[PDB]
Each structure stands twice: as C-alpha cells, then as structure tokens.
Ligand binder design. Sequence first.
Ligand SMILES: O=c1n(Cc2ccc(O)cc2)[nH]c2c(Cc3ccccc3)nc(-c3ccc(O)cc3)c[n+]12
Length: 295
Amino acid sequence: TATGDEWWAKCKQVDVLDSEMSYYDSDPGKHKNTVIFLHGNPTSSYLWRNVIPHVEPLARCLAPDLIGMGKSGKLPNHSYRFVDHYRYLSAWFDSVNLPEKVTIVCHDWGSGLGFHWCNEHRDRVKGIVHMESVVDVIESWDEWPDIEEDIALIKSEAGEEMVLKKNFFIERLLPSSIMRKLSEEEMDAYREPFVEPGESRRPTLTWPREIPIKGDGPEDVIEIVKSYNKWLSTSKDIPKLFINADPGFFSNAIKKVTKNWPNQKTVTVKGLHFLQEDSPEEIGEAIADFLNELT
Ligand SMILES: O=c1n(Cc2ccc(O)cc2)[nH]c2c(Cc3ccccc3)nc(-c3ccc(O)cc3)c[n+]12
C-alpha cells in the first residue's frame, strides 16, 4: 500500500554532526512511552511502516533511517562501519527530545546498534524488543545459518562488484527473505536510496563485512558484541521480548543463544529474515502487549 513518497512525507529530518538523518516521529501529544525502531541491512524506517500503527495508540514511535540509508545523508568518505553508524545514531538519539526511559525495538544490524546503545546507557532502557538480531559473536558455524562461504565471498573484491554494481543485497537477498511478494511500489521504496550505482550502495556492502565471526571478524565489532552479550545475558531488570521468526533465518540460532537470558519473553510469528513484511500486525500487537505489561 503506502508508497515511498507517502512514507517519507510523514518523516522529519534533523542535522546530525556534519550530516542529517531522516526519521519518523509520531504526532506530538500526551504519551506514557517512547519507542525507537531500528532497521538493519539493507532496509530503512520504511521497514516498520505497518508495525508502527499498532504501537502508536500507546507510545510515541520514532524510526530513524541509519546514516547512508533511507533518506538520511550520504557520507563523503564512504566509511559506514559499525562504529560510524553508532556515531551518527548516538548523536541522533541526543537530538529528538527523548525522555529518560525508552524502549528499543530492533532488527538485524539495528539490533547491533541498539544493543550497544543500551549497554552504554543502561539507565535509559525500559525494555528491548528484538528479532533476527545480532545477539552474540559467531563462534562455531554449526550453530548458525551456513553463510560462511557467502561472507568470505562478500568480503572479497567480488563484493564491490556484487553490491556497488549489481546491488545484490536489494535485488537478490531482500526478496529472497520475504515470504510474500512485494508490490512494485514497496520494492521501489527499498530501491530508492540505492538507485545510483557505485558508492551510494556502500552501506549494504560494509554491513555484512562487519559480521562478528570469532577469529575472522573486525575486532572492534567483536569486542562490542561480546560486551553487550555479556550484559544482556544477565539483564534481570531489563524486560525483553524476542520475536522469533518461523522459519526465520537467524531465529533458530538466536533461540539457542538466549535460552538462559533472564526476563525474556518469546512470541513466534511467520516469516523469514524480513519478518516485518510477512507478519506486521502480529509483530505490532506483540509490542503493544509487551508495553501494556510494562505498566
Ligand atoms: O551480516 C549479516 N547480517 C547481520 C546479522 C548477523 C548475525 C545475526 O544474528 C543477525 C544479523 N545479516 C546478514 C544476512 C541476513 C539476510 C539478509 C537478507 C536476506 C537473507 C538473510 N545475510 C548476509 C549475507 C547473506 C548472503 C551473502 O551472499 C552475503 C551476506 C550477511 N548478514
């Protein structure tokens, strides 16, 4: 239904350091909860468009486009590592009138950014809802989807060609992990940030190169994931909602990683990796119920 123009015309923009980030912000009013939605690779705030209306009745809902993605600014040095994204997203957090306690709803690399933000601002966290999330370092490939060889390929010089020239993540990976078929308006919304070939597509390539593989990953990312995984593994006072996807992609592995995490509820919905496009109403209602139980 809702087109890219329709969605981004509901969004605001805010200067962030040298650049600017676009974001959805629900209409100002009286509200008891503030919920931030973080997408990952290769999507944008558009990914939450059908989830958010089920949470807005009870929360101010923010959804930023990460730097270089959606309608946020492109960085001239083309450097979009995890640590760069966190720099701009942290500044964004500081610029949108957040109350003292927020709930984070995150997905894919958005969960990596959000988990790290929560671990660094533990006093600001009311709750965490996560799905298909970066919950741990990948220490043995046998407990995870078998993408070892794909990651090796994407780290190779063939990565530049697959992504920058052929837009592999948008054109092949994205539709392959959505059970239904996206309308052309929906698929154009995901295309829009990356229509120009070359370095405009750089974030969708840098993101998989950051994947924290023990002994094979960037060590700044590994150290961050290890530290937020330790903290999460005993976060007794942080109510957590793991939305498990069936069949999912990482969902099976995440179930095993977090089986002994305290204060995590699990709700299951139908979907592959981009579960928001297959079960948005179930995902939004679960978040609504989760916030309702918080009070
Ligand atoms: O880093 C990657 N994350 C971040 C992440 C890590 C651990 C975790 O628990 C959660 C999230 N995710 C991916 C995905 C996921 C996906 C995207 C779209 C469709 C299907 C699957 N797929 C790849 C990849 C797949 C083929 C390739 O040829 C190259 C890369 C890489 N990552």
